[PDB]
Structure 1
Amino acid sequence: QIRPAFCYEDPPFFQKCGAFVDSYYFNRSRITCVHFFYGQCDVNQNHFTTMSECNRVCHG
């Protein structure tokens, strides 16, 4: 329970529901956050505008 349950969800890779923008998600295999292009499909909360925030909320 050290990090929120949504940290373990796959971000919506390649899904376009609008503009693609720089984003960061927690990668549960690397156990750290990783850049990706977010297309506004708000399927879950595993996406952050900054690397640091992602690593704050989810890294642990």
Structure 2
Amino acid sequence: QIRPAFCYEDPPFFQKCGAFVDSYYFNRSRITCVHFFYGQCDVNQNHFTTMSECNRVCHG
């Protein structure tokens, strides 16, 4: 329970609902946050604007 449960949810890779932008998501295999292009599909909450923010909320 150390990190939220959305941390383990896959980002909407390759899905376009608008502008693609630099974003970061928690990778549950690397157990750290990784860069990806997010296209405004609010499928879940596993997308952050900063790598550090992602590394605070989701890293543990």
Superposition TM-score, scaled by structure 2 size: 1.00
Number of residue pairs aligned between Structure 1 and Structure 2? 60
Seq. identity, %: 100
Q: Deviations over 1:5-56 (max 9, x none)?
A: 0000000000000000000000000000000000000000000000000000
State the superposition RMSD in angstroms.
0.2
CA distance, structure 2, for counterparts of residue 31 and residue 8 of structure 1: 10
Q: What are the ranges of 5 or more consecutive residues in structure 1 without an aligned counterpart?
A: none
For residue 59 of structure 1, report the CA deviation from its aligned partner: 0.4
Q: What are the ranges of 5 or more consecutive residues in structure 2 without an aligned counterpart?
A: none
Superposition TM-score, scaled by structure 1 size: 1.00
Between structures 1 and 2, the one with greater helix share: 1
Runs of 4+ in structure 1 displaced over 4 angstroms? none
